[PDB]
Write a protein that holds these residues in place. Structure first.
Motif, PDB file in Angstrom:
ATOM      1  N   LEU A 120      -3.953   2.130  10.457  1.00 30.07           N
ATOM      2  CA  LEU A 120      -3.324   1.279   9.697  1.00 30.07           C
ATOM      3  C   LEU A 120      -2.474  -0.046  10.344  1.00 30.07           C
ATOM      4  CD1 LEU A 120      -2.452   3.278   6.736  1.00 30.07           C
ATOM      5  CD2 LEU A 120      -3.948   1.516   6.426  1.00 30.07           C
ATOM      6  N   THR A 124       4.333   5.424   2.791  1.00 25.86           N
ATOM      7  CA  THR A 124       3.630   6.784   2.644  1.00 25.86           C
ATOM      8  C   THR A 124       4.622   7.926   1.754  1.00 25.86           C
ATOM      9  OG1 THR A 124       2.737   8.714   3.741  1.00 25.86           O
ATOM     10  CG2 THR A 124       4.872   7.964   4.563  1.00 25.86           C
ATOM     11  N   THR A 149      -1.594  -3.924   9.683  1.00 30.06           N
ATOM     12  CA  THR A 149      -0.676  -4.341   8.886  1.00 30.06           C
ATOM     13  C   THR A 149       0.916  -3.609   9.360  1.00 30.06           C
ATOM     14  OG1 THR A 149      -0.317  -4.364   6.491  1.00 30.06           O
ATOM     15  CG2 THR A 149      -1.282  -2.191   7.319  1.00 30.06           C
ATOM     16  N   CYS A 207      -3.387  -5.031   2.065  1.00 33.56           N
ATOM     17  CA  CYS A 207      -1.913  -5.058   2.152  1.00 33.56           C
ATOM     18  C   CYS A 207      -1.185  -5.613   3.098  1.00 33.56           C
ATOM     19  CB  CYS A 207      -1.475  -3.467   1.828  1.00 33.56           C
ATOM     20  SG  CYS A 207      -2.303  -2.548   0.563  1.00 33.56           S
ATOM     21  N   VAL A 250       3.505  -1.006   8.735  1.00 33.09           N
ATOM     22  CA  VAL A 250       3.542   0.449   8.266  1.00 33.09           C
ATOM     23  C   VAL A 250       5.019   0.936   8.734  1.00 33.09           C
ATOM     24  CG1 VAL A 250       2.919   2.746   8.520  1.00 33.09           C
ATOM     25  CG2 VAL A 250       1.152   0.511   9.012  1.00 33.09           C
ATOM     26  N   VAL A 310       2.434  -1.210   4.137  1.00 35.32           N
ATOM     27  CA  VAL A 310       1.982   0.062   3.614  1.00 35.32           C
ATOM     28  C   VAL A 310       3.096   1.294   4.049  1.00 35.32           C
ATOM     29  CG1 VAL A 310       0.395   1.901   3.818  1.00 35.32           C
ATOM     30  CG2 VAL A 310      -0.309  -0.766   4.080  1.00 35.32           C
ATOM     31  N   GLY A 324       0.783  -1.408   0.087  1.00 36.54           N
ATOM     32  CA  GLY A 324      -0.008   0.026  -0.028  1.00 36.54           C
ATOM     33  C   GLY A 324       0.757   1.250  -0.055  1.00 36.54           C
ATOM     34  N   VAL A 358       0.242   5.356   0.573  1.00 37.88           N
ATOM     35  CA  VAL A 358      -0.515   6.476   1.048  1.00 37.88           C
ATOM     36  C   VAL A 358      -0.001   7.692   0.515  1.00 37.88           C
ATOM     37  CG1 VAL A 358      -1.590   7.646   3.070  1.00 37.88           C
ATOM     38  CG2 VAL A 358      -1.252   5.228   3.209  1.00 37.88           C
ATOM     39  N   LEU A 400      -7.507  -0.884   2.581  1.00 39.33           N
ATOM     40  CA  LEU A 400      -6.152  -0.872   2.447  1.00 39.33           C
ATOM     41  C   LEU A 400      -5.352  -1.858   3.271  1.00 39.33           C
ATOM     42  CD1 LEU A 400      -4.088   0.649   0.246  1.00 39.33           C
ATOM     43  CD2 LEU A 400      -3.570   2.098   2.452  1.00 39.33           C
ATOM     44  N   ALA A 401      -5.629  -1.627   4.648  1.00 35.62           N
ATOM     45  CA  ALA A 401      -4.807  -2.576   5.519  1.00 35.62           C
ATOM     46  C   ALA A 401      -5.174  -4.053   5.542  1.00 35.62           C
ATOM     47  CB  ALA A 401      -5.066  -2.243   6.982  1.00 35.62           C
TER      48      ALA A 401
END
Lengths: 385, 391
Positions: free
Chosen positions: A86, A73, A90, A68, A92, A71, A10, A12, A64-65
């Motif tokens: 998130l 950004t 998941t 994926c 991040v 994730v 993912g 963001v 999304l979470a």
């Protein structure tokens, strides 16, 4: 443990950084879902999936979470609360806590100092009350300078009175007052750090700004000797380690007339000064973002070719002025340049100050990359000073 | 005549790995790509700006592609030339159908290369049972032992029969129903090479370095660039031969010509591909402009890119076989991509295909290093890790 090719990743934010992430991720066999509310999202257009939704839309974030395995950004003002949300479900990378430090001028200055890296002279002004408790002499220490909101929001100020009035004019919000320094040249360090604490540093980039916007990057930095490169790289890594940072980190520094070296700010993401890596290095900054977020081994940052990067703003489309309407630049002429690599971001509307693309220049010899970038800037009417 | 500038829609007929890598190149330069591919799991369609999920002979889909796109190119192996000429009624098609058609017919291909003044690998053309009956045994013996190959539709090893005697050759032709074929002599091969060039509508061309190719089990296994066995004169000879063929064809696009170098030093052309080629994937990581960028430039009448190789390179193909270390029937095992990603020279390219199958091209790994020996050593170590035989 690693998240292997084929997994959903993912992103963001769906601007140019997200778009270039998509190409890196898809090339390695990952699928990319982009969250970006903009229906014309440049990254969303080329992603495996585009979630057209607001950055605080919990239904979109959950989707999304859920989809994926990791994730990351790129969006400038992403609410850390969204990254928090998130990370309940998941992986991040970078973490919201790191993004929040980097997005706040006060937090970022405090953190770099805490990492044992010298910071550009400033005074923190949290509030009107904090300002009241600073006497004129305390302000004069960092004047003339620029008052900047901790989270557009900048005022050039020369006297304590101007500084006090500027703070009130900005609504009394948290600010840093940054002293104007005798700048010689600007550089950025660009590093990737993994969940296992291993890192990989790119070479040192030398950056020229015009009207406050990045114009030209040259790599390796012509002005910096081996000791300076090492100093800057170690500084960036020390900051990343102190932060527990997983991802790509860009730290920008000033080298002053007296030879001193000070850190000014950092970006918790791939950075515009790193775009050269796509055409000049064995692994790009976008590939490192993929590797860091998947807990895969970091790539080799080896620079195979000296490089320069020229930014392309929307201003290039307005040779008759902004009001007179867009004129398509001579992209054929640019493509005829043997050193050039043309990157255009798929944005619909050229606007003044808007980043529409960049042109990387690579050659066997650095002088030739630089001469090609300079000649292209002349062709395209891009001011470098 | 004019250039088709960034922002334009470009079409791609075929949505496999070549079309996918085309999309990355085209989109990076600001073009939008529409992929036509009937496969709902199209790797290129997944990453394109638009996917027309349609059969290659669907005229409604073709008319929409041609209407949308300012130029259209191809990657699909068996594309009907009639579809390319349908498209050319309303858009710029590069390479043109007539060029693609020559490459799809083994007989036309051999004849065309010879007609371009480039030496061709020894063979006999067998158009029909009547033509075969009029060739004496000695005419056949000249190219035997060898392999009888159907002229058309024999992709991925199909339509081929190994033969040693004139009798076996005659029987093989009858076994295939008497269709047009080429009988290709088995040669005393020393090494194989491919030239890869781009040619524009203005007749200008740009040549990559010479690639040395190793095949195993009828499939490309390993490419090394620059070719270790080829000296400067050989590189130039091969590049000029490929440009000569492209000029004679009036070809606009990327052309790959494959050759043999024999034990006696003979240099002969064997076949050509009217598209980016598997032996060119190294260009994405080793050259200033990739073969896919050159396909974009050629079809848009934009200036060709600089083909400069910045780093010595090797490429290892990844077949679906790599997922079946216990045999095809025993079930899939995910390969150790993390261990590959740890190799400093490696660039991992995986194509997003859903099902690993034996003989199916699932990805490739490019290896770059300052020194060629190091890139080769890395490719060889990765082949050992993944249990990929190179000979």
């Amino acid at each position: 443990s690693p998240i292997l090719p084929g997994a959903w990743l993912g992103m963001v934010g769906g601007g140019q950084l997200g778009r270039m992430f998509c190409f890196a991720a898809q090339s390695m066999g990952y699928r990319v879902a982009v969250l970006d509310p903009d229906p014309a999202s440049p990254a969303g257009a080329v992603a495996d999936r585009h979630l057209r939704a607001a950055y605080d839309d919990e239904a979109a974030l959950a989707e999304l979470a859920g989809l994926c395995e990791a994730v990351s950004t790129e969006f400038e003002n992403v609410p850390a609360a969204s990254l928090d949300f998130l990370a309940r479900t998941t992986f991040v990378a970078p973490a919201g806590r790191c993004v929040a430090v980097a997005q706040d001028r006060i937090a970022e200055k405090r953190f770099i100092e805490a990492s044992g890296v010298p910071v550009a002279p400033h005074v923190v002004i949290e509030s009107a009350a904090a300002l009241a408790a600073l006497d004129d002499a305390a302000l004069d220490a960092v004047l003339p300078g620029i008052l900047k909101t901790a989270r557009k929001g900048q005022v050039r100020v020369s006297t304590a009175r101007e500084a006090r009035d500027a703070h009130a004019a900005l609504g009394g919000v948290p600010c840093v007052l940054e002293k104007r320094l005798p700048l010689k040249y600007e550089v950025s360090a660009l590093i990737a750090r993994g969940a296992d604490g291993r890192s990989a540093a790119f070479p040192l980039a030398q950056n020229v700004h015009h009207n406050g916007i990045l114009a030209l990057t040259i790599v390796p930095a012509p002005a910096a000797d081996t000791a300076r490169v090492e100093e800057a790289q170690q500084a960036a890594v020390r900051i990343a380690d102190t932060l527990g940072y997983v991802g790509v980190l860009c730290v920008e520094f000033f080298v002053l007339e007296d030879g001193s070296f000070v850190a000014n700010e950092m970006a918790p993401r791939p950075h515009n000064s790193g775009h050269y890596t796509v055409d000049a290095c064995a692994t790009s900054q976008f590939e490192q973002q993929v590797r860091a977020m998947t807990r895969m081994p970091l790539g080799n940052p080896r620079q195979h070719s000296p490089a320069a990067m020229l930014n392309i703003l929307g201003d290039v489309w307005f040779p008759n002025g902004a009001a007179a309407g867009a004129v398509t630049p001579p992209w054929d002429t640019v493509a005829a340049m043997p050193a050039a690599h043309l990157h255009l971001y798929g944005k619909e509307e050229a606007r003044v100050g808007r980043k529409m693309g960049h042109v990387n220049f690579t050659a066997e010899m650095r002088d030739d990359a630089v001469a090609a970038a300079t000649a292209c800037a002349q062709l395209l009417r891009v001011p470098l000073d």
